[PDB]
Amino acid sequence: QNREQQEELMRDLAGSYMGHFMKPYFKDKVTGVGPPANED
DNA sequence: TGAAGAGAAACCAGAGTATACCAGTTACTTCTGTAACTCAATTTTCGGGTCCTAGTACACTGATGG
Structure with missing residues (x-):
């Protein structure tokens, strides 16, 4: 859990x-x- | 017996002479490009924010005047 908190910090x-x-x-x-224009 | 030159001891500029720079060029190197992987450092560039000063809209207020 602490290393996951560290990775969240990073x-x-x-x-x-x-x-x-x-x-x-x-x-x-x-x-x-x-993208190019629609037909609309 | 002076005369027309003869000799003699000063200055004075100038022509070689002496320097005095001032360019004039031969080799002899590096440095390009391309390729590549690597990694870090550094730059560029690039879309978007960011803050700030200055108007702007807009509903309301507050008289104002006829």
Whole structure:
């Protein structure tokens, strides 16, 4: 349990926003552009 | 018996002479690229926040005047 608490502390140190999920919610991890437009 | 030069002891600039820098170039190296795995250090860049000062909307207030 204590080592799990330590690992939780470390994943807190290694945790990270909401702007990244704005208008183009989906986006490449390469280029960072959304998918093409719908037909709608 | 002076005359026209003869000799003599000073200055004075200048032409070789003496330096005095000032470039003029031959080898003889490193340093590129590519490849790779490694690891850490360092930089770049990149999307998003972050704080701050300055207006802005908006419902309400508070008279105000005719």
